[PDB]
Write a protein that holds these residues in place. Sequence first.
Motif, short mmCIF file in Angstrom:
data_model
loop_
_atom_site.label_atom_id
_atom_site.label_comp_id
_atom_site.label_asym_id
_atom_site.label_seq_id
_atom_site.Cartn_x
_atom_site.Cartn_y
_atom_site.Cartn_z
N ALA A 60 66.28 67.72 80.21
CA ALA A 60 64.74 66.64 80.77
C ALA A 60 64.59 67.02 82.28
O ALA A 60 65.83 66.09 82.99
N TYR A 73 64.26 64.05 85.51
CA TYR A 73 63.37 62.29 85.51
C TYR A 73 63.61 61.95 87.27
O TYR A 73 64.80 62.84 87.79
N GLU A 129 70.85 65.31 77.33
CA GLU A 129 70.98 64.38 76.47
C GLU A 129 72.45 63.38 76.62
O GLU A 129 73.10 62.25 76.79
N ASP A 172 66.79 58.16 75.47
CA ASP A 172 65.13 58.50 75.87
C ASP A 172 63.93 57.52 76.45
O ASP A 172 63.09 58.45 76.83
N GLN A 173 65.17 57.46 77.26
CA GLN A 173 64.05 56.60 78.85
C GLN A 173 64.00 58.31 79.52
O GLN A 173 62.92 58.07 79.80
N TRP A 174 64.89 58.96 80.04
CA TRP A 174 65.39 59.54 80.84
C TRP A 174 64.28 60.68 80.04
O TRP A 174 63.35 61.53 80.74
N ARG A 175 63.95 61.11 79.15
CA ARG A 175 63.24 62.50 78.35
C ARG A 175 62.21 61.89 78.42
O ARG A 175 61.49 62.83 78.96
N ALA A 176 61.75 60.51 78.48
CA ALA A 176 60.75 60.66 78.78
C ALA A 176 59.66 60.46 80.55
O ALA A 176 58.58 61.04 80.08
N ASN A 194 58.58 59.94 84.26
CA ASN A 194 58.47 59.19 84.91
C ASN A 194 57.72 59.79 86.05
O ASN A 194 57.43 59.62 87.69
#
Length: 259
Positions: free
Chosen positions: A50, A52, A64, A250-254, A256
């Motif tokens: 993902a 970021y 991940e 979880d934060q990286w995949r979401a 920004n």
Amino acid sequence: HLTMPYVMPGDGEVVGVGEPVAIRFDENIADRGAAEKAIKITTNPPVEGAFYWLNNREVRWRPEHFWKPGTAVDVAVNTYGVDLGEGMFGEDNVQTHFTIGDEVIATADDNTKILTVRVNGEVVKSMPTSMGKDSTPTANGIYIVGSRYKHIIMDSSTYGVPVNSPNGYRTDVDWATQISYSGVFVHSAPWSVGAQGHTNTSHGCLNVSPSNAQWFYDHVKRGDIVEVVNTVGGTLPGIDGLGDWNIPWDQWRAGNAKA
């Protein structure tokens, strides 16, 4: 109103298991989503990853977990003529193919004051170390290895801190391997060999012997990992530049992209 992408690693490189794909634009990107949609990453063996953003100009992509050794990665940055927002268009496409090398993980444990280097799980070196003194401790966390220098004049004014001020420093050093953009290195410290393995004496860098620092320079490469554990410090910022793995998946995949 043209922006040029630049992709790292470069074509044909072999990098360590912590190395993110990095796409750097030379202008602020108004529509991050537009840039992300223009960038397609192929992996073999295939793995999820993902995007970021580290800042307004640079996006990173990684999985991940640390990459599997031997993975082949193709990056297609198809930005030529793509509207990146506010009338800014991509000037060119860029492409790269790179490969993940051996798994090299060096762990600096403040409870033992040893930095242990493991290659594909096997200990190849054990190095006594002296890390940041309690007032200027080394942060715990996961650091990605960057550039290496045979000799460097470490001068805090590089980072906007006057040498003769509370957080300043100036030290000529040999065999320096960079592990953060903020200026943390593994380097040679002949003057602290007595303390290595016993007491922390530095400003934050990991001091090792000259032969161990040269070994590290010779055998640890861009994208390999240093993990610091059990210090009295905080945690390395996720957006340091080499601190990507301190952002949880979880934060990286979401992402920004709307920020």
